Design a protein that fits this description.
alpha+beta, DNA polymerase, domain 1, Beta Polymerase, domain 2, 4 domains, 5-stranded mixed sheet, two-stranded antiparallel ribbon, binds 2'-deoxyuridine 5'-alpha,beta-imido-triphosphate, binds chloride ion, binds magnesium ion, binds sodium ion, DNA-binding, transferase/dna, Nucleotidyl Transfer
DNA sequence: CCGACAGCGCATCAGC
DNA sequence: GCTGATGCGC
DNA sequence: GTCGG
């Protein structure tokens, strides 16, 4: 946190652009600016010293100069005072409600937690669960809790079928001391890029996790992706753990390294890496890395046997998960 | 300038 | 019912 | 909002 103030300001700017102006590129520019300034190993002394970083342009440079001078940003003062903005911004904190739905509620005059609660009949399922656990979802997960959750998830998966491999990814895999949610990569040998020799693969696991009351709620669910709610069991007389977001992603087993690379993140590191891929003439997704032909179209999956081969293809030295926290 | 800016699964709706 | 577009999240 | 060509 050499520049906690600056990166905070840009995050806020990013959030405003995304949630209020629905200007998704401004949002990503601000987020890239914050990321790169966050790993910059010096206390920034000026807008111009910042301009030197890539992703920091002129507009962001003046803003940073303004911030270093006054301790703030007037553009943000105004935004904070603007009732309709703060309301829309607030509503997009409920899982399942984004910039559009938030703006639509605020039009109807639904602009607070109280308002949301008494208009529940107006929410889709996801939004309704998001609201249920609003408070809990605001809380981070200490890694110590993640270790307990991991041990539950992996042991219950092994119980359904010892063939499953479940790998906790996301910020946990990058060694963070706390995580927003839990992201779990799932593989079984019956599901490859060549075939689905068994159905319900994800269902079974979800079912087993619900049966032991680990999974309490479902936000959305398909054949290969689950997003719902879970809870550590508490002890006698013991106060309950908060409810936690959980993602479970079933990926073809012969496509694990591309899968674990994707799910390990961070989201900004994934973006940078994939952008660099395109520059090298490749496209990377959670399944494969493919070459782009002159025409532009993606070719056939290159052979991959380690996270590192993907790094090799695009001429990046390997970065351990802990160093992918952008 | 000016186009590109990562990639995609699931829920919901429109239009048929 | 379907596909295609959009919203929302990982 | 920023950047590469
Ligand atoms: O826009 C996204 C979002 C997520 N992802 C990936 C990478 C990421 O680490 C993973 C899990 O997504 P999260 O939303 O859980 N972010 P993360 O786990 O890295 O941080 P945290 O959970 O601690 O808030 O899925 C993307 O590639 N693009
Ligand atoms: Cl934009
Ligand atoms: Cl400010
Ligand atoms: Cl792979
Ligand atoms: Cl693919
Ligand atoms: Mg996570
Ligand atoms: Na720059
Ligand atoms: Na939200």
């Amino acid at each position: 946190t050499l520049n906690g103030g600056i990166t905070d300001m840009l995050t806020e700017l990013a959030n405003f652009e995304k949630n209020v102006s629905q200007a998704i590129h401004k949002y990503n520019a601000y987020r890239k600016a914050a990321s790169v300034i966050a790993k910059y190993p010096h206390k920034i002394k000026s807008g111009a010293e910042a301009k030197k970083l890539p992703g920091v342009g002129t507009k962001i440079a003046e803003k940073i100069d303004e911030f270093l001078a006054t301790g703030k940003l007037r553009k943000l003062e105004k935004i904070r005072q603007d009732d309709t903005s703060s309301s829309i911004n607030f509503l997009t904190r409920v899982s399942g409600i984004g910039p559009s739905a938030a703006r639509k509620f605020v039009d109807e005059g639904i602009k607070t937690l109280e308002d949301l609660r008494k208009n529940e009949d107006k929410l889709n399922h996801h939004q309704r669960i998001g609201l249920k656990y609003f408070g809990d979802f605001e809380k981070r997960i200490p890694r110590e809790e993640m270790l307990q959750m991991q041990d539950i998830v992996l042991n219950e998966v092994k119980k359904v079928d010892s063939e499953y491999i479940a790998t906790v990814c996301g910020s946990f895999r990058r060694g963070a001391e706390s995580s927003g949610d839990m992201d779990v990569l799932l593989t079984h040998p019956s599901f490859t890029s060549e075939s689905t020799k068994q159905p319900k693969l994800l269902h079974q696991v979800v079912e087993q996790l619900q049966k032991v009351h680990f999974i309490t709620d479902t936000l959305s669910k398909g054949e290969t992706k689950f997003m719902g709610v879970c809870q550590l069991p508490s002890k006698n007389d013991e106060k309950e753990y908060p409810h936690r977001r959980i993602a479970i992603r079933l990926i073809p087993k012969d496509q694990y390294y591309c899968g674990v690379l994707y799910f390990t993140g961070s989201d900004i590191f994934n973006k940078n890496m994939r952008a660099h891929a395109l520059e090298k003439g490749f496209t990377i997704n959670e399944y494969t890395i493919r070459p782009l032909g002159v025409t532009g179209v993606a070719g056939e999956p290159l052979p991959v046997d380690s996270e590192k081969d993907i790094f090799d293809y695009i001429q990046w030295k390997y970065r351990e998960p802990k160093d992918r926290s952008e």
